[PDB]
């Protein structure tokens, strides 16, 4: 239906055209028209602070050693998302104490992580989970709504007498012991710890978009136009990681004065609200004289890598994110310039070594013979979330990995009688894990059900599959590695699609890693499974470059099979690598039909991958096109059912290896080990991430 007022703002028209839901277009128009009439935003606000400006109230590392007589009790608020439940359990182990409190909010989109957090809250009386769950997108207004609601919840928990409020994510980690944290805060229990930009405040406003009106809907932040900064108050901001004492949280929650009321309205339509809301309120409130310009955090900003506007599809704005710590950063945690107790970010799938160094440095080594200290397991599919949360690609390949494990069990037993290790697959995978060892990706772990055919009984197994090496070097050049994948993370310089799983409708990206040396120009060539040359281009490697990548515009679908990517230097071979474009056995999670398989597995719809042709280079690169295998690719493109499964399993076996397979419960295969007794299974002991009973000192670590 038509809007309540003429909508002419260029920004609002752009958002109305991109929004999908009807509810979202309506809410956009309603917000715009309200602001047009001046009924949405405040224009002047009262300032209650007596000071004419800001206060900002000698760091001696030996002051955190005394024992408090009246130690503070802390309420930790954990805002978490993703799949890294074992890392979160490790950090929870490091910060836990029986006298503190823990209130955990799990992103609405992360049900696997939520089910794991629930098991934690059930074990301990001082651990609770938020019953409400928002989709806290990056920069979304909902993050402030999350904090403010948890503050109200926590203030109403009579049985939890807490003195400080600390917020942490699944990527934070302490850099000092709990004893020192309590000693420090017990000395300054009337202070509030927040860090400001300290530079030009007008530039801070513009780059944060504070003078712009935003609306959060459909998990997106829509920019709707301009707005005025309210008069009569000082606007400030910086980090959205802080420590606030109960006195001030009580004021922000229950105050009805002009300042708190109007600031809650203003910041309901603000981008990155938690980065300036608490600063602004504090500095203009009666508590202005309690502010310390230090958030007690070390944040690993590296704006040469972390500001690629990577959230352009989530928010109508460009921003930055902090980098992940590496082992060479350990010395930074030992600075004595200012007091610091936490740091971010840490990601175990990126680098776990620094996590282990930090945790042993704070609370010591685990006893000798402790297993799994250098390993990491991360669940990437859990049965309760349903096969429709997977894609046709991952569903196809996870199925193939399970069959590759069953064939290993059969061939592992050497006998001339009945083979008691022959299995028949049943149903869909029950879970999948990534598996790392010493910060090296080891492959996938698939748990699946199968019938042992000798005894005719159903068994639960887990298979470990590892990808075969495909990078090969052919004169000391600068090239160190080359790879093909999708979902390239520019900040961390790696593919988030860890397995390199690809289907016919994927758009692969080529990456090259280089070492130091003078600048050079090289040639890249893409070759399909029947020697069709899909693309060629030259790229300049500058003397300062370390990684290069590019995504060639390839017409879809890609011909299934094993592709090759070559790197030449003036026709001199340099290196090559391979990747798999797998045919799919599923369409909308159902077995693919012939008419569907035909259109998907027979190559590009335009008869070629690009407008420009490279048929001239086939004889030059010794890549002739065998007329026979071209036709056998047609025949393959028409197959379904058993024939298609044989084609797929043939390709997967050529690029992956079933390393081992174990049973979770009783088994009839005489040569299969119990998963709990292996070193690689997600069922094996992992004490660094396991949580048990509380010890006499009130600790878990």
């Amino acid at each position: 239906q038509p809007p309540k007022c003429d909508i002419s703002g260029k920004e609002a028209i752009s958002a109305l055209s991109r929004a999908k839901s009807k509810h979202c277009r309506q809410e956009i128009g309603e917000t715009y028209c309200r602001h047009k009439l001046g009924l949405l935003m405040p224009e002047k606000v009262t300032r209650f602070c007596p000071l004419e400006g800001k206060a900002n109230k000698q760091w001696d590392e030996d002051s955190v050693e005394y024992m408090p007589a009246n130690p503070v009790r802390i309420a930790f608020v954990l805002v978490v998302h993703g799949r890294a439940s074992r890392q979160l359990q490790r950090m929870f182990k490091a910060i836990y104490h029986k006298d503190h409190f823990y209130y955990i909010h799990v992103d609405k989109r992360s049900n696997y992580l939520h089910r794991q957090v629930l098991q934690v809250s059930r074990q301990y009386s001082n651990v609770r989970v938020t019953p409400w769950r928002m989709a806290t997108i990056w920069g979304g207004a909902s993050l402030l709504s999350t904090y403010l609601q948890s503050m109200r919840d926590l203030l109403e928990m009579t049985d939890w007498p807490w003195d400080f409020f600390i917020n942490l994510s699944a990527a934070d980690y302490p850099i000092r012991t709990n004893d020192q944290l309590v000693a420090f805060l017990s000395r300054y229990r009337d202070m509030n710890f927040l860090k400001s930009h300290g530079r030009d405040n007008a530039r801070f406003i513009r780059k944060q978009g504070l003078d712009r009106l935003f609306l959060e809907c459909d998990a997106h932040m829509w920019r709707l136009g301009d707005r005025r900064i309210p008069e009569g108050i000082a606007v400030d901001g910086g980090s959205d990681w802080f420590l606030l004492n109960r006195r001030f949280v009580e004021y922000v929650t229950f105050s009805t004065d002009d300042l708190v009321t109007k600031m809650k309205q203003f910041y309901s339509y603000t981008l990155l609200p938690a980065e300036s809301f608490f600063h602004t309120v504090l500095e203009n409130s009666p508590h202005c004289d309690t502010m310390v310009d230090n958030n007690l955090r070390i944040t690993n900003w590296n704006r040469k890598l972390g500001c690629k506007c990577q959230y352009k599809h989530i928010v109508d704005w460009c921003g930055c994110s902090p980098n992940d710590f590496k082992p060479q950063d350990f010395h930074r945690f030992q600075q004595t310039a200012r007091p610091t107790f936490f740091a971010r970010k840490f990601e175990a799938v990126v680098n776990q070594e620094i996590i282990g160094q930090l945790d042993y440095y704070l609370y010591g080594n685990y006893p000798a013979g402790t297993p799994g200290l250098r390993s990491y397991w991360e669940n990437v599919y859990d049965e309760p979330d349903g096969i429709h949360s997977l894609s046709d690609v991952t569903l196809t390949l996870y199925h193939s990995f399970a069959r590759l494990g069953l064939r290993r069990a059969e061939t592992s037993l050497h006998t001339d009688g009945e083979n008691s290790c022959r299995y028949y697959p049943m149903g869909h995978p029950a879970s999948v894990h990534l598996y790392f060892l010493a910060d090296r990706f080891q492959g996938f772990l698939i748990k699946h059900h199968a019938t042992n055919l000798a005894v005719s009984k159903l068994e639960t197994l887990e298979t470990w599959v590892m990808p075969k090496k495909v990078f090969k070097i052919a004169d000391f050049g600068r090239l160190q590695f080359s790879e093909v994948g999708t979902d390239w993370d520019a900040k961390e310089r790696l593919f988030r699609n860890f397995g390199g799983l690809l289907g016919p409708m994927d758009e692969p990206v080529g990456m090259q890693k280089w070492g130091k040396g003078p600048n050079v120009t090289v040639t890249v060539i893409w070759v399909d499974p029947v020697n069709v040359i899909a693309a060629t281009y030259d790229i300049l490697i500058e003397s300062t470059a370390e990684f290069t990548h590019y995504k060639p515009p390839l017409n879809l679908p890609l011909r299934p099979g094993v592709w090759t990517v070559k790197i030449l230097h003036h026709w001199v071979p340099v290196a090559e690598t391979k990747f798999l474009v797998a045919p799919l056995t599923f369409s909308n999670r159902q077995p693919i039909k012939p008419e569907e398989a035909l259109k998907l597995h027979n190559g590009p719809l335009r008869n070629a991958y690009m407008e420009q042709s490279f048929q001239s280079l086939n004889p030059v690169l010794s890549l002739p096109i065998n007329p026979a295998q071209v036709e056998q690719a047609r025949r393959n493109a028409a197959s379904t059912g058993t024939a298609l499964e044989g084609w797929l399993d043939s390709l997967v076996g050529g690029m992956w290896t079933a390393m081992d397979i174990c049973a979770t419960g009783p088994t009839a295969c005489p040569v299969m080990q119990t998963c709990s007794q292996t070193a690689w299974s997600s069922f094996s002991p992992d004490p660094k991430s396991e949580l048990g009973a509380v010890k006499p000192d009130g600790r878990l670590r």
């Binding site: 920069g139 978009g209 500001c307 460009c318």
Partner: peptide, 9 residues
């Protein structure tokens, strides 16, 4: 040098 996460439009 925690100067906020926003860059610009």
């Amino acid at each position: 040098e925690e100067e906020g996460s926003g860059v610009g439009q």
